């Protein structure tokens, strides 16, 4: 499984983590291998990585946790373009899933 396909997926995974709430990498680790069955234990360098990068983009947006005790928590949130990004994601999938089967129902048919 080559690095190009393990980075998409990995994004498309911290995108609907995102999606269902607010959390923070270590948190988000330990929900993706219980949710892997302990197959994908996420690194917490490719979290922060990935995140950076979707910053800039602003796909999502960072905020400090309460600090009662947690003296340094960073939480990320998936912001409105970034719901507004998936949601044409989304569009474009099912999009493509009409033109194939009409593709195949056109070519039989000639």
């Given at each position: ?84 990004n998936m949601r044409l994601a989304?569009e ?19």
């Amino acid at each position: 499984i080559p690095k190009e396909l393990l980075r998409a997926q990995t994004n498309v995974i911290l995108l609907n983590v995102l999606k269902q709430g607010d959390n923070y990498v270590y948190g988000i680790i330990k929900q993706v291998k219980e949710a892997s069955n302990g197959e994908m234990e996420l690194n917490e360098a490719t979290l922060y990585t990935i995140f950076d990068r979707l910053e800039q983009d602003g796909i999502i947006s960072s905020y400090w946790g309460d600090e009662s005790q947690g003296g340094r928590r960073k939480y990320y949130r998936l912001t409105e373009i970034g719901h507004e990004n998936m949601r044409l994601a989304x569009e474009s999938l099912s999009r493509v899933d009409k033109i194939i089967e009409n593709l195949e129902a056109n070519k039989k048919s000639e």
